[PDB]
């Protein structure tokens, strides 16, 4: 095999097609059906394609291999190996030049726009209804004029000469040959130099680029029309003989036969000089046949013989799932593989798996033969086979010996994440079922209810090393998604341990003193002491407190027997305290965590195995069961229910009299029923929880019960409080189809019996649930496929880019408290710059250091609040990332290794968990100082810190300078405490009207009406003395027809008349009353500062929408630059807002629809990208205005909200990598080296600017603008075209790459997979690096 | 069900699909992605060519395994050549370059 | 059986060229050009190469020195 690269694609010239072909196929016949020898001139022909049987001619004159180039005189077939019949192509000489459907019907019709003729006309031409005048010489008719029948008639009669018109693909080919590429190209450049308008300039630039591509690539356009047509080798379009004298053939054979028929009939008709109409009909018919051959389905859909289904054409074979790339080039079918049902097998070690004898023998057959021949037990391979078929003891001994260290791969059908394939050492067992280690089931999401698994065998030495090193179970204990352990004990183990550790007030052997665990076990196994009984024991724990030395501390602790028995296994390093407690699910998980962090891997593995074994054993000894009497119906249920029924009856009767609406009664009933449910639940938990009143020596006592169902609840083994309720209480409220909640609940439980109605309702519930899970799984699968697709090519290429940039990460304190602390958020990230203690010049962390647990604890000891850390998005490396910018986090602990494909791991980690997807006063929870951020207040006369800013926040500083609680305080909210004041727990710090945003006046004086005329634009509807009114200052849209341009206003003047000016500014306060300006305080009351002017009253789809960046149909509006905004030309149909910069130029106008309400006033201080209208913001604006770190923080937080709502932890780095892959593209705004408008990746722009500015000449000095593109288009715009063709529209990408003459250096992973060479990732990176040195070297 | 080696398919020289005839398991794209998450390049390579698609490769590997040596010679998958032939059957010239 | 490779990855932290050096060693061992430097306990050559790596006797540079010594030896 040669070492090659660069697969090149281009238009095939007709002479090259003639070059490939070995012969003409003249007749459509294949074989004589009598003698099965092939036809002399047929789709299957020996003289063209090859000999049927190896090295023997058709007529049978020459059959020996001695002859290798001779061509039999009788049958013109050369004698060679039949394999060649797999590669020889044929050809058909078409009489009429025919168009290639792909280059015509593809949505952008490249023949169409290349010829600058719309698609509709070309279609009109292809079906032979009308002519077109192609280069009609010196007449009064243009060059692309379509001509109808009688238009051709009157033209011909009028213009005998100077009239050139023709029809069909031959006319089109004539048009193509005569085109001058460069002259039109230069003309187009001149036109672009003269034209300045967006859309026409874009279509023109695309077209000019197309012309440049043709003149550079060297393809001539006329080649789009076919003259000779190649025919695929026969073995690729087989004619297989079905058992029973019948044959099975692909439909392509039929299509080829039809094509040959139409060609031969057209040839004969031409030789006969038939009238034009008939030859035109024949040419049309040949067109249908050919286009059905190429892509059947873009026409009248020529169906197949007697099947009513459309037959499959070549395009169908390539494109699509069933066809190709997915099925046969990414979805192969390996050898040495098996499948079977999975089973428990508790006795196994964590690193091993039970494998049936017979499958193992079948798989390892060739190894067995090799070893048998090596030992000399068998002379030859057939004797080895016979020895395997007898199955003697020696064979089993050799099989045991060879299997010894050879590892096998286990896979489970939905491989969601990388833990779907793992390696194990097999142990031969009887039976036909595979035995799977229990601890790994959680990783596989495996269940023993008929699930099956596949088993592959790695052959080569490198495969063995890879399986044992990278894939072995013990090397993968941490999930790649988050750092936490994956292998935690599931249900039986935790139940057994829980039973073991819980203590009881009084039992046998209370308070006796034991010298160690060994006699504790002596006592338990002899039945002289209970497994749980409080006792004082002497124990020697070990602690590595010094620099790696273990110090024994030995003292007397008061514990249970069970905890000591468990202590027997526990390795040295762990504190005794760990086991001293109840030891539930959480306790065991954190136990494993500590064991890993202190000792390391190997002790953790052995400790997990020991835990499993002991848990199973003592769970079996416990004998825990579940009887009908074990779940006690609370005695006071019936009273509570009857009371609630009486209450519902009273509220319904008080409804029938008509003092309360139906909805109010509904709400009341639902709330009272909820309260009754909570009451019964609490009563049940009280009854069941602590009921064991067992007696000590004298009086009695009570303790946490040993009720088996209670232990199952409390231990966290199975069930939650909700299910306990569902077993023994009333099973709450239900939802009807539409989501509305039924009024009467289900009062019965499964211990009792339901009746028809309650069952029926719950049936509906369960049905909806199941359907939900089904659709959820389908959508999940699809989403994760897209994710893994887009991010595949990203690889860690460089060790360190060396940038100082990074994102300043803070703990996300959503509202009430700290949903997620800093320490976990920063663990394993390198720092962007040294962080200082709360006192300057006290460096805590040198320049970029990887933040491991020790640094995080050190930060916890201090009070660092926010840390700028290097992020992947800001990484400087070109074409990949550097180790430092990423960080450490992995299934292993150390810094990321160069070469790891983080894209795929990130995509899997994001995808797999995706299968479960009044307000009057603020009340500070903890005693702290109140602090206001982004505000400018003005103390009024009432003694309130009046809020005049719309972006005001009220955070909470604790004793040591940290923001515990954070709230957003709107404009017009009454405040109580200012700055410095310490606030007691749950004290009202703020106040505001729920259904009212007041407008606050800054100065005093009399309210003056200006352009506030009565009757034309306003309607005086005023109330009585107390000074109530409904004066309505309407907006521009709702203003009356006469008062369309007259804008009523309210100027705030003083007692004398002069408009009092805002302090410090000269602006005459002229408040144009906005829409719905309810002027309550009428003319005649000296305005106080603060009078109101106008009262103004998730899951998977959400994730998909965030990741597709869809504008949420009501976007908020932002500010571009800061400075005084102002109004403008009023009521054109969309009200104008002109942002006036205090320094910069004014002319930025933004139209606003009538319905939009604005929250900010004209004379306000906006910041760039500040909110102007309320509502959800579309990510595009935030990215464009605020920049990268803002949009990345927004996306990460928005996704993490959905994910944490379900309680699934994911590390931000994966989302970060995806986001970085999303914004790969930019758009050029200046000039100097690019084409001034081309969408170009940010990578090429950065590298070219680095080059240019490195070069002594300034050159381009180019400035660019970032762009954000959705994952679909971003994947569509990949560099390699094989990646895109692998999954997208095959016709489109194939046509683009064919016309562009593109050259693929493969450079990627998926390309290398397709070509079957080593991927450039991981173990193969070095290989590619070696090849990398071979290029561009000596 | 299990198979070591057996009959291969006619057109694409991959092992038959099914249970009546021995037939191998389908190593799908998701499994490929799983392997890519690890650095497992040689296992995937052999799985892709020597195990299924390379005729000379499969026979050479059978003989080599029998000999008690464990190497490989990946070559180019036949299905890729079929792809080339099918694309060439259209008017598209796609060539494997060399330098 | 080698149930954990933790010491071998702690010897060379890349975790990838570990596989390459172990492959070179196990390839010199399988085709019987060389001999194991550790007393074998009926292990196969993979676990032998890992056992040699974990004891610090073999790495890439030791491979390079032994190969060039063998080259100059057979050159004469
Ligand atoms: Mg199952
Ligand atoms: Zn002959
Ligand atoms: Zn970097």
Curated annotation (Swiss-Prot), chain C:
Highest taxon in the source lineage: Bacteria
Q: Which GO terms describe its cellular component?
A: cytosol; cytosolic DNA-directed RNA polymerase complex; RNA polymerase complex; transcription elongation factor complex
Q: Does the keyword Nucleotidyltransferase apply?
A: yes
Q: What is its EC number?
A: 2.7.7.6
| Gene that encodes the chain | rpoZ
Q: Which family does it belong to?
A: Belongs to the RNA polymerase subunit omega family.
Q: Which GO terms describe its molecular function?
A: bacterial-type RNA polymerase core enzyme binding; DNA binding; DNA-directed RNA polymerase activity
Q: Where are the transmembrane segments?
A: none
GO biological process, any = protein-containing complex assembly
Keyword Transcription found: yes
Question: Which keywords has UniProt assigned to this entry?
Answer: DNA-directed RNA polymerase, Nucleotidyltransferase, Transcription, Transferase
Reaction(s) the record says it catalyses: RNA(n) + a ribonucleoside 5'-triphosphate = RNA(n+1) + diphosphate
Chain's role: Promotes RNA polymerase (RNAP) assembly. Latches the N- and C-terminal regions of the beta' subunit thereby facilitating its interaction with the beta and alpha subunits. Part of the processive rRNA transcription and antitermination complex (rrnTAC). The complex forms an RNA-chaperone ring around the RNA exit tunnel of RNAP. It supports rapid transcription and antitermination of rRNA operons, cotranscriptional rRNA folding, and annealing of distal rRNA regions to allow correct ribosome biogenesis.
Self-association and partners: The RNAP catalytic core consists of 2 alpha, 1 beta, 1 beta' and 1 omega subunit. When a sigma factor is associated with the core the holoenzyme is formed, which can initiate transcription. The rRNA transcription and antitermination complex (rrnTAC) consists of RNAP, NusA, NusB, NusE (rpsJ), NusG, SubB, ribosomal protein S4, DNA and precursor rRNA; S4 is more flexible than other subunits.
Give the first-level EC class, as a single word.
transferase
Q: What is this protein called?
A: DNA-directed RNA polymerase subunit omega
Which species is this UniProt entry from?
Answer: Escherichia coli (strain K12)
């Amino acid at each position: 095999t040669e070492e090659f690269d660069a697969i090149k694609i281009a238009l095939a010239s007709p002479d090259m097609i003639r070059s490939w072909s070995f012969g003409e196929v003249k007749k459509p016949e294949t074989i004589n059906y009598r003698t099965f020898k092939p036809e002399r001139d047929g789709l299957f022909c020996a003289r063209i394609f090859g000999p049927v049987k190896d090295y023997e001619c058709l007529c049978g004159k020459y059959k020996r291999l001695k002859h290798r180039g001779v061509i039999c005189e009788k049958c013109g077939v050369e004698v060679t190996q039949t394999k060649v019949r797999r590669e020889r192509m044929g050809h058909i000489e078409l009489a009429s030049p025919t168009a290639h459907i792909w280059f015509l019907k593809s949505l952008p019709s490249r023949i169409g726009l290349l010829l600058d003729m719309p698609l509709r006309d070309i279609e009109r031409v292809l079906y032979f209804e009308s002519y077109v005048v192609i280069e009609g010489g010196m007449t009064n008719l243009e060059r692309q004029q379509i001509l109808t029948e009688e238009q051709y008639l009157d033209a011909l009669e009028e213009f005998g000469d100077e009239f050139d018109a023709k029809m069909g693909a031959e006319a089109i080919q004539a048009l193509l040959k005569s085109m001058d590429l460069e002259q039109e190209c230069e003309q187009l450049r001149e036109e672009l130099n003269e034209t300045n308008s967006e859309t026409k300039r874009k279509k023109l630039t695309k077209r000019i680029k197309l012309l440049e591509a043709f003149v550079q690539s060297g393809n001539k356009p006329e080649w789009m029309i076919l003259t000779v047509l190649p025919v695929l080798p026969p073995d690729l379009r087989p004619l297989v003989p079905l058992d029973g004298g019948r044959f099975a053939t692909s439909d392509l054979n039929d299509l080829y036969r039809r094509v040959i028929n139409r060609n031969n009939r057209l040839k004969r008709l031409l030789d006969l000089a038939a009238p034009d109409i008939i030859v035109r009909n024949e040419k049309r018919m040949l067109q249908e046949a050919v286009d059905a051959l190429l892509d059947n389905g873009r026409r009248g859909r020529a169906i197949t013989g007697s099947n009513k289904r459309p037959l499959k054409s070549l395009a169908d074979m390539i494109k699509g799932k069933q066809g190709r790339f997915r099925q046969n080039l990414l979805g192969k079918r390996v050898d040495y593989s098996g499948r079977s049902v999975i089973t428990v097998g508790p006795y196994l070690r964590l690193h091993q798996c039970g494998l049936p004898k017979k499958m193992a023998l079948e798989l390892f057959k060739p190894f067995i033969y090799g070893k048998l021949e090596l030992r000399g037990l068998a002379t030859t391979i057939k004797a080895a086979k016979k020895m395997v078929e007898r199955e003697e003891a020696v064979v089993w001994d050799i099989l045991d010996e060879v299997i010894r260290e050879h590892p096998v791969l286990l896979n489970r059908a939905p491989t969601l994440h990388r833990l779907g394939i793992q390696a194990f050492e097999p142990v031969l067992i009887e039976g036909k079922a595979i035995q799977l280690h229990p601890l790994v089931c959680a990783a596989y999401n495996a269940d023993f209810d008929g699930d099956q698994m596949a088993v592959h065998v790695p052959l080569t030495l490198e495969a063995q090393l890879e399986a044992r090193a990278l894939m072995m179970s013990t090397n993968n204990i941490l999930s790649p998604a988050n750092g936490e352990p994956i292998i935690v004990p599931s249900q039986d183990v935790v139940l057994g341990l829980y039973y073991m550790t819980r203590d009881c007030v009084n039992a046998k052997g209370e308070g006796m003193v034991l010298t160690g665990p060994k006699e504790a076990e002596r006592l338990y196994r002899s039945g002289l002491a209970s497994l749980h009984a409080r006792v004082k024991v002497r124990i020697t724990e070990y602690e590595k407190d010094a620099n790696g030395e273990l110090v024994a501390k030995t003292s007397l602790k008061d514990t249970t027997v069970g905890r000591a028995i468990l202590w027997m296994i526990v390795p040295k390093g762990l504190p005794y305290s760990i086991v001293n407690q109840a030891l539930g699910k959480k306790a065991i998980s954190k136990m494993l965590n500590t064991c890993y962090r202190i000792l390391g891997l190997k002790p953790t593995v052995i400790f997990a195995d020991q835990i499993m074994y002991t848990g199973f054993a003592y769970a079996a000894r416990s004998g825990a069961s579940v009887g009908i009497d074990d779940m006690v119906i609370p005695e006071k249920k019936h009273e509570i229910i009857s009371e609630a029924e009486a209450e519902v009856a009273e509220i319904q009767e008080q409804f029938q009299s008509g003092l309360v609406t139906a909805g109010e009664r509904y709400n009341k009933v639902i709330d009272i029923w909820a309260a009754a449910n909570d009451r019964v639940s609490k009563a049940m938990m009280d009854n069941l929880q602590t009921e064991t009143v067992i007696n000590r020596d004298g009086q009695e006592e009570k303790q946490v019960s040993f009720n088996s169902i209670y232990m199952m609840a409390d231990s966290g083994a199975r069930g939650s409080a909700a299910q306990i309720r569902q077993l023994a209480g009333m099973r709450g409220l239900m939802a009807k189809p539409d989501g509305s909640i039924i009024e009467t609940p289900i009062t019965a439980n499964f211990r009792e019996g339901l009746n028809v109605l309650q069952y029926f309702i719950s049936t509906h519930g369960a049905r909806k649930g199941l359907a939900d899970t089904a659709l959820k799984t389908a959508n999940s699968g699809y989403l994760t496929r897209r994710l893994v697709d887009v991010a595949q090519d990203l690889v860690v290429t460089e060790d360190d880019c060396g940038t100082h940039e990074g994102i300043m990460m803070t703990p996300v304190i959503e509202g009430g408290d700290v949903k997620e602390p800093l320490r976990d958020r920063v663990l394993g990230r390198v720092t962007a710059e040294d962080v200082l203690k709360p006192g300057t010049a006290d460096i805590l962390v040198p320049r970029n250091t990887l933040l491991h647990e020790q640094w995080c604890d050190l930060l916890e000891e201090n009070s660092v609040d926010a840390v700028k850390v290097r992020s992947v998005v800001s990484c400087d490396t070109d074409f990949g990332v550097c180790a430092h910018c990423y960080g450490r986090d992995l299934a292993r602990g150390h810094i990321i290794n160069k070469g790891e494909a983080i894209g795929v791991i990130a995509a899997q980690s994001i995808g797999e968990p995706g299968t479960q997807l009044a307000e009057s006063s603020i009340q500070v929870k903890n005693k702290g100082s109140i602090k206001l951020s982004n505000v400018k207040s003005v103390v009024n006369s009432s003694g309130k810190l009046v809020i005049t800013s719309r972006n005001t926040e009220l955070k909470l500083i604790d004793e040591f300078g940290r923001t515990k609680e954070s709230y957003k305080v709107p404009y017009g909210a009454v405040l109580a405490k200012g700055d410095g004041e310490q606030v007691a727990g749950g004290e009202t710090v703020a106040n505001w009207d729920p259904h009212t945003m007041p407008v606050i006046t800054e100065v005093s004086g009399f309210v003056r009406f200006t352009d506030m005329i009565d009757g034309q634009t306003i309607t005086r509807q005023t109330d009585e003395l107390t000074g109530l009114s409904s004066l309505v200052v309407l907006d521009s849209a709702e203003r009356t027809a006469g008062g369309k341009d007259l804008r009523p206003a309210l100027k705030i003047v003083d007692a004398q008349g002069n408009d009092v000016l805002i302090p410090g500014t000269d602006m005459p306060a002229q408040y144009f009353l906005p829409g719905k300006a309810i002027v309550q305080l009428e003319d005649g009351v000296q305005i106080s500062s603060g009078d109101t002017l106008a009262r103004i009253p998730g899951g998977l789809p959400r994730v998909a929408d965030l990741f597709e960046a869809r504008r949420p149909k009501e976007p908020a509006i932002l500010a571009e630059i800061s400075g005084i905004v102002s109004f403008g030309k009023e009521t054109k149909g969309k009200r104008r807002l002109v942002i006036t910069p205090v320094d910069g130029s004014d002319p930025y106008e933004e139209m606003i629809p009538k319905w939009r309400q604005l929250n900010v006033f004209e004379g306000e201080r906006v910041e760039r990208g500040d909110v102007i209208s309320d509502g959800p913001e579309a990510p595009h604006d935030i990215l464009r205005l605020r920049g990268v770190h803002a949009v990345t923080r927004y996306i990460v937080n928005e996704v993490q909200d959905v994910y944490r709502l379900q309680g699934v932890k994911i590390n931000d780095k994966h989302i970060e990598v995806i986001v970085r892959q999303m914004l790969r593209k930019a758009t050029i705004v200046n000039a100097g080296s690019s084409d001034f408008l081309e969408g170009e990746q940010v990578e090429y722009s950065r590298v070219k600017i680095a080059n240019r500015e490195l070069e002594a000449n300034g050159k381009v000095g180019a400035t660019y603008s970032r762009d954000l593109l959705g994952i679909t288009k971003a994947s569509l715009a990949t560099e390699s075209f094989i990646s895109a063709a692998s999954f997208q529209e095959t016709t489109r990408v194939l046509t683009e790459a064919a016309v562009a003459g593109k050259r693929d250096e493969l450079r990627g992973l998926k390309e290398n997979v397709i070509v079957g060479r080593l991927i450039p990732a991981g173990t193969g990176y070095a290989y590619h690096q070696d090849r990398m040195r071979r290029r561009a070297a000596g | 069900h299990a198979r070591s080696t057996g009959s291969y398919s006619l057109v694409t020289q991959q092992p038959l699909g099914g249970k009546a005839q021995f037939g191998g398991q389908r190593f799908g794209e998701m499994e490929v992605w799983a392997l890519e998450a690890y650095g497992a390049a040689y296992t995937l390579q052999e799985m892709l060519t020597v195990k299924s698609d390379d005729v000379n490769g499969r026979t050479k590997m059978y003989k080599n395994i029998v000999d008690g040596n464990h190497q490989m010679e990946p070559g180019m998958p036949e299905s890729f050549n079929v792809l080339l032939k099918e694309i060439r059957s259209l008017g598209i010239n796609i060539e494997l370059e060399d330098e | 059986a080698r149930v954990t490779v933790q010491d071998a990855v702690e010897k060379i932290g890349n975790r990838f060229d570990l596989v390459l050096v172990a492959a070179r060693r196990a390839r010199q061992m399988q085709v019987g050009g060389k001999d194991p430097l550790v007393p074998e306990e009926n292990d196969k050559t993979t676990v032998i190469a890992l056992r040699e790596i974990e004891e610090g006797l073999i790495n890439n540079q030791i491979l390079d020195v032994r190969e060039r010594q063998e080259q100059q030896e057979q050159e004469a």
